[PDB]
């Protein structure tokens, strides 16, 4: 039921956690830090938008950069230039 990105450890992780919080109002976010990588999860669906991620980074951002840094993920994906949606 839990879905979301598994990201390689590094400087992108914290703005993605923040994005998961901002872009999924009213949902519990779980973060499992496995050191080399981090799983971020919500129940049912997890959305990360380009606009919010770009704001949390403080510099220009395109969804391609997040996608290349996904080591893995849970759920199904719908994605475009504006957001990615992980969903059951």
| In the chain, where the domains are located | 1-88
For helices 13-23 and 50-57, angle between their N-to-C axes, nearest 10 degrees: 130
Cα Rg of the chain (Å, integer)? 12
CATH of 1-88, picked from 3.40.140.10, 3.40.50.970, 3.90.56.10, 3.40.1390.20, is: 3.90.56.10
CA 70 to chain centre: 9
CA-to-CA separations, 63 to 1, 32, 88, in angstroms, rounded: 24, 22, 21
Question: Resolution in A for the shown PDB structure?
Answer: 2.0
Method: X-ray
Instruction: Check residue 69 and report its DSSP letter.
Output: T
Residue 70: which of 28, 41, 25, 38 has the closest Cα?
Answer: 38
Contact in structure between 1 and 88 (CB atoms under 8 Å): yes
């Amino acid at each position: 039921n839990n879905v979301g990105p598994i990201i390689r450890a590094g400087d992108l992780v914290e703005p993605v956690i923040e994005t998961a919080e901002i872009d999924n109002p009213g949902k519990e976010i779980t973060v499992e830090d496995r050191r080399a990588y981090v799983r971020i999860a919500a129940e049912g669906e997890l959305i990360l938008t380009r606009k919010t991620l770009e704001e949390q980074l403080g510099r220009p951002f395109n969804m391609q950069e997040l996608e290349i840094n996904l080591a893995s993920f849970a759920g199904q994906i719908q994605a475009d230039e504006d957001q990615i949606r992980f969903y059951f």
